Scaffold this active site. Sequence first.
Site, PDB file in Angstrom:
ATOM      1  N   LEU A  46      37.603  41.722  53.278  1.00 28.25           N
ATOM      2  CA  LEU A  46      38.071  40.341  53.288  1.00 28.25           C
ATOM      3  C   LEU A  46      39.577  40.274  53.042  1.00 28.25           C
ATOM      4  O   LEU A  46      40.234  39.303  53.420  1.00 28.25           O
ATOM      5  CB  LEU A  46      37.312  39.499  52.254  1.00 28.25           C
ATOM      6  CG  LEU A  46      35.797  39.295  52.416  1.00 28.25           C
ATOM      7  CD1 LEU A  46      35.240  38.445  51.280  1.00 28.25           C
ATOM      8  CD2 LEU A  46      35.445  38.668  53.758  1.00 28.25           C
ATOM      9  N   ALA A  48      42.944  43.307  51.710  1.00 26.42           N
ATOM     10  CA  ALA A  48      43.374  44.541  51.060  1.00 26.42           C
ATOM     11  C   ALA A  48      44.821  44.429  50.588  1.00 26.42           C
ATOM     12  O   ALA A  48      45.728  44.215  51.391  1.00 26.42           O
ATOM     13  CB  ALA A  48      43.210  45.727  52.013  1.00 26.42           C
ATOM     14  N   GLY A  49      45.027  44.572  49.281  1.00 32.78           N
ATOM     15  CA  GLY A  49      46.366  44.512  48.701  1.00 32.78           C
ATOM     16  C   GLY A  49      46.879  45.863  48.237  1.00 32.78           C
ATOM     17  O   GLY A  49      46.264  46.900  48.503  1.00 32.78           O
ATOM     18  N   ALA A  50      48.005  45.842  47.528  1.00 33.84           N
ATOM     19  CA  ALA A  50      48.654  47.059  47.038  1.00 33.84           C
ATOM     20  C   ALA A  50      47.875  47.787  45.934  1.00 33.84           C
ATOM     21  O   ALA A  50      47.962  49.015  45.814  1.00 33.84           O
ATOM     22  CB  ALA A  50      50.069  46.745  46.562  1.00 33.84           C
ATOM     23  N   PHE A  51      47.120  47.033  45.137  1.00 36.48           N
ATOM     24  CA  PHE A  51      46.425  47.587  43.975  1.00 36.48           C
ATOM     25  C   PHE A  51      44.943  47.875  44.210  1.00 36.48           C
ATOM     26  O   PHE A  51      44.333  48.655  43.477  1.00 36.48           O
ATOM     27  CB  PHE A  51      46.568  46.649  42.785  1.00 36.48           C
ATOM     28  CG  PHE A  51      47.965  46.155  42.562  1.00 36.48           C
ATOM     29  CD1 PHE A  51      49.006  47.049  42.302  1.00 36.48           C
ATOM     30  CD2 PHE A  51      48.239  44.791  42.591  1.00 36.48           C
ATOM     31  CE1 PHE A  51      50.306  46.589  42.087  1.00 36.48           C
ATOM     32  CE2 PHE A  51      49.531  44.320  42.376  1.00 36.48           C
ATOM     33  CZ  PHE A  51      50.568  45.222  42.124  1.00 36.48           C
ATOM     34  N   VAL A  54      39.350  43.550  48.364  1.00 41.83           N
ATOM     35  CA  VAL A  54      38.165  42.725  48.167  1.00 41.83           C
ATOM     36  C   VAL A  54      37.281  42.884  49.401  1.00 41.83           C
ATOM     37  O   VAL A  54      37.706  42.606  50.521  1.00 41.83           O
ATOM     38  CB  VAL A  54      38.515  41.232  47.914  1.00 41.83           C
ATOM     39  CG1 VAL A  54      37.245  40.401  47.697  1.00 41.83           C
ATOM     40  CG2 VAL A  54      39.441  41.096  46.714  1.00 41.83           C
ATOM     41  N   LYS A  74      35.021  43.041  44.282  1.00 44.23           N
ATOM     42  CA  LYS A  74      36.393  43.430  44.005  1.00 44.23           C
ATOM     43  C   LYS A  74      36.423  44.863  43.499  1.00 44.23           C
ATOM     44  O   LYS A  74      35.552  45.280  42.733  1.00 44.23           O
ATOM     45  CB  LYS A  74      37.002  42.511  42.948  1.00 44.23           C
ATOM     46  CG  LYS A  74      37.089  41.041  43.328  1.00 44.23           C
ATOM     47  CD  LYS A  74      37.941  40.304  42.307  1.00 44.23           C
ATOM     48  CE  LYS A  74      38.678  39.136  42.924  1.00 44.23           C
ATOM     49  NZ  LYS A  74      39.952  38.883  42.208  1.00 44.23           N
ATOM     50  N   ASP A 177      48.042  30.273  38.067  1.00 45.78           N
ATOM     51  CA  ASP A 177      48.351  30.479  39.478  1.00 45.78           C
ATOM     52  C   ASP A 177      47.530  29.590  40.415  1.00 45.78           C
ATOM     53  O   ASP A 177      46.967  30.068  41.405  1.00 45.78           O
ATOM     54  CB  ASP A 177      48.219  31.956  39.870  1.00 45.78           C
ATOM     55  CG  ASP A 177      49.186  32.356  40.980  1.00 45.78           C
ATOM     56  OD1 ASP A 177      49.638  31.474  41.742  1.00 45.78           O
ATOM     57  OD2 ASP A 177      49.496  33.562  41.087  1.00 45.78           O
ATOM     58  N   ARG A 181      46.492  29.480  48.240  1.00 44.91           N
ATOM     59  CA  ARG A 181      46.107  30.879  48.477  1.00 44.91           C
ATOM     60  C   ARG A 181      44.988  31.353  47.542  1.00 44.91           C
ATOM     61  O   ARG A 181      44.290  32.319  47.854  1.00 44.91           O
ATOM     62  CB  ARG A 181      47.324  31.809  48.354  1.00 44.91           C
ATOM     63  CG  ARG A 181      47.993  31.744  46.994  1.00 44.91           C
ATOM     64  CD  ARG A 181      49.215  32.634  46.856  1.00 44.91           C
ATOM     65  NE  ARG A 181      49.882  32.348  45.588  1.00 44.91           N
ATOM     66  CZ  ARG A 181      50.861  31.456  45.437  1.00 44.91           C
ATOM     67  NH1 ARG A 181      51.312  30.771  46.482  1.00 44.91           N
ATOM     68  NH2 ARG A 181      51.392  31.246  44.240  1.00 44.91           N
ATOM     69  N   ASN A 182      44.827  30.676  46.405  1.00 45.65           N
ATOM     70  CA  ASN A 182      43.795  31.036  45.420  1.00 45.65           C
ATOM     71  C   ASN A 182      42.566  30.118  45.397  1.00 45.65           C
ATOM     72  O   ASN A 182      41.685  30.262  44.541  1.00 45.65           O
ATOM     73  CB  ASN A 182      44.402  31.180  44.020  1.00 45.65           C
ATOM     74  CG  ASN A 182      45.274  32.419  43.889  1.00 45.65           C
ATOM     75  OD1 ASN A 182      46.311  32.398  43.221  1.00 45.65           O
ATOM     76  ND2 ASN A 182      44.865  33.503  44.538  1.00 45.65           N
ATOM     77  N   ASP A 195      40.869  33.726  41.752  1.00 45.85           N
ATOM     78  CA  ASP A 195      42.078  34.500  41.937  1.00 45.85           C
ATOM     79  C   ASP A 195      41.809  35.539  43.003  1.00 45.85           C
ATOM     80  O   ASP A 195      40.884  36.346  42.868  1.00 45.85           O
ATOM     81  CB  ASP A 195      42.523  35.157  40.633  1.00 45.85           C
ATOM     82  CG  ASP A 195      43.983  35.580  40.666  1.00 45.85           C
ATOM     83  OD1 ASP A 195      44.312  36.536  41.404  1.00 45.85           O
ATOM     84  OD2 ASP A 195      44.800  34.957  39.948  1.00 45.85           O
TER      85      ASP A 195
END
Length: 317
Positions: A46, A48-51, A54, A74, A177, A181-182, A195
């Site tokens: 769904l 994919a980020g740097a850390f 999901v 997650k 936040d 986007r959230n 989040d």
Amino acid sequence: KPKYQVRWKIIESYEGNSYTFIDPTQLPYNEKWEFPRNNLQFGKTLGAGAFGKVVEATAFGLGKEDAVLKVAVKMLKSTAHADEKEALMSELKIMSHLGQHENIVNLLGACTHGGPVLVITEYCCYGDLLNFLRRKAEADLDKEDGRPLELRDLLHFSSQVAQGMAFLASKNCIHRDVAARNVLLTNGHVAKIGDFGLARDIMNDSNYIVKGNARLPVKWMAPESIFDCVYTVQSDVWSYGILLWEIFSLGLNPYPGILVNSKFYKLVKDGYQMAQPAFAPKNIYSIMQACWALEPTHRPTFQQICSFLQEQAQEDR
């Protein structure tokens, strides 16, 4: 480094005038959430980020032996910075502790044995509010084709997030936040606030600016948070007004094209505000304006806003 972290907080108190927050590290993981890794059937990513990423999964036997249920799971990357590994755990914890609500992304379970920690949450088939809005706004019918967006839809998203926020506030929880986007959209385009920072790449997001210590969403932040570093429920209400703008402009970036200074920060503290968005009725714009009161205590409450927007959405006799 920076590391992965979700920025939720829960107040213990309360008595200062100063806030002392819960240390989620000291919270216990309730084992009731444990779910067998092998009872999950993994699917599409769904986000994919740097850390970490999901991932969508199908869960079998969650809450009932025969149940078949699409979920969101997650996870961090294999090269996780030792914790982090705990931040994901914190996680989870803060989130056990809050309990369930219709308009928040709910915790469904976790996998803590037999591999890396996995956090199972509610799946939201329509994705984030921002992309949805932008996809309905774009003018090309090969991409999107559906019913035309109307005011009532925008009011629904707004009141549904406000309600979720009203719940968190009732449980001494500051999101820190609130942004389109959230907000994730589930069945029937019902909005849920969570989040989704794990799914995004924070290091090349122009929305997240170096403010000395960390990388913060400054355009969504109250002056006293910038300041001054004060975060409260009223501070989340300021961010909600920015979110309102995001919704009623159909996904435009806040303060479009503004050079994020200085200066910009001082001008906002001295009471600069965005112009009325294209699709906001006067009376919704005046909610935005109230959310951006320099005096935090003059800002409206999520419950007030919620009620007002549910009233406005009501179709006449």
